Amino acid sequence: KVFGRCELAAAMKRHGLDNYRGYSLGNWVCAAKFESNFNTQATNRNTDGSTDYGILQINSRWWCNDGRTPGSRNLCNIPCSALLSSDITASVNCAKKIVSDGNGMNAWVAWRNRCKGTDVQAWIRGCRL
């Protein structure tokens, strides 16, 4: 499914993402916008044999198991298919693990490139949260 901006803001808030690890809700909604355009089933294949899955485009080489990625890790201990559902919980729970692993949200290229250092609060303005 394709989430609406405010709809996603509310869902992510419900899942404890607001200021999780020092990143306000706006960062999360912005990341989703530029990673998957708020689409839960978006997927992208990379030159290294891995695929990005879901709304937060979680890569299969380190985070989930899709069963066809060369030297994969399954650091979130979840199948990649579970990241493609309408219920963002699995994606949120894995994203929390990724953000606690090293370079914060730099793990999401789109966020580095398009959100980092911008008024990310604009993504939550006009919503009831």
Report the distance separating Cα 49 and Cα 94, nearest Å: 21
**Residue 119 known to bind ligand:** no
Q: Which of 48, 52, 66, 119 is catalytic?
A: 52
Rounded Cα–Cα distance for residues 66 and 80 (Å): 5
Q: For residue 114, count CB atoms less than 10 angstroms from its CB and return exposed for 0-12, middle for 13-18, buried for 19 or more.
A: middle
Among 35, 48, 66, 87, the active-site one is 35
35 is catalytic: yes
Is residue 7 among the annotated active site residues?
no
Annotated binding site for substrate: which residue ranges?
A: 101
Annotated binding site: which residue ranges?
A: 101
Just list the catalytic residues.
35, 52
